[PDB]
Amino acid sequence: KNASVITVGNEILKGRTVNTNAAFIGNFLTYHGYQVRRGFVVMDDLDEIGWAFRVALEVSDLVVSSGGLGPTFDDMTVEGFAKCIGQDLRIDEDALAMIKKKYGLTPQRLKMAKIPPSCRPIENPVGTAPGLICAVGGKKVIILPGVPKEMEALLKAMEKDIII
Amino acid sequence: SNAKNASVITVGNEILKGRTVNTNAAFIGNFLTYHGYQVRRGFVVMDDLDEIGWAFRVALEVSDLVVSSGGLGPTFDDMTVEGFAKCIGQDLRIDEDALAMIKKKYGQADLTPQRLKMAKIPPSCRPIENPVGTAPGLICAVGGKKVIILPGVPKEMEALLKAMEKDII
């Protein structure tokens, strides 16, 4: 199988931060028997993100993204994904319950529970933003936070969804 | 409109596979940012003609300055120049200055095929001297857009990018 990796974040493009997430993702996917075909790095911009998901989906069976998931309005990954697949976001009650725990919540916080119907939320064992696994036809998309420790914990949590 | 937009391309299976981290893309991103560009998209692709061609074409669609590193070197696996030529519709021809540069570096009249091929360039490009390693860089013009094609060895990539800074201002 083929996989593609997406990195969402202006700080990566500007070289403020070395893209360690893409290396961890690529190595994890390669270890599991995937050909990692392409890497896309895009701005926090919902149309740029939508474009990357669309091309990634065309050339692979599995697409993994990191970045653009927090409570900030710079976090546009899920929206970009939803625009790509042509589905509205809905506040998910399961995600909402996850968020509530973490906090004991404003619009920017509530935003983190909004997902397309195509996605299942995966609880974040380290931070706040749930990961997403989505089905787009027979293909799979995994959407991860940008914080390395969260990304790593979540991707390992999702191994059985990855194993070929 | 794409005037202050730049894109970065990294070519190399080992980067995709996460065997090495992409430090070149960080250095290029920071260099371009430092000179007032907006770095719009980053592409990482395999050592593969069609994939390399894809990345350059998309990069050129969204930016007026495109900088690539990787896939320049004395091995058949180093395919970046050829991928670039194919994607702009040009043929490679031996550049005699480039060829002379190379023979001097190797102190040998008789290069292997993989070494000789480092002098093969499309007409839209000029070679840039690599004082550190053996593969020349290339600066190319595609209409009013510019394309800088660099070795993937960080010390060489950084040396050549710095030597090109007056083309970048």
**Any residues with CB less than 8 A from the CB of B134 and at least 6 apart, and which?**
B73, B74, B102, B105, B106, B115, B118
Per CB-CB distance under 8 Å, the chain B contacts of A19 are 21-22, 25-26
CA dist A123 and B87 (Å) reads: 44
Number of Cβ within 10 Å of residue B88's Cβ equals: 17
Tokens, residue A101: 């725990």
Q: Where are the beta strands (DSSP E) in chain A?
A: 2-8, 35-42, 62-66, 90-91, 114-115, 119-122, 131-136, 139-144
Distance from CA of A132 to the nearest CA of B (A): 22
Reading the block at residue A157, the tokens are 């949590």
Name the CA dihedral angle for A124, A125, A128, A129, rounded to a multiple of 10 degrees: -10
The structure was resolved experimentally with X-ray
Q: Give, to the nearest 10 degrees, the angle between helix A20-31 and helix A148-157.
A: 20
Full set of structural domains in chain A with CATH: 1-164 (3.40.980.10)
Residue A57 touches partner B, C-beta closer than 8 Å: no
Contacts of B23 in chain A (CB under 8 A): 18
d(CA A80, CA B24): 27
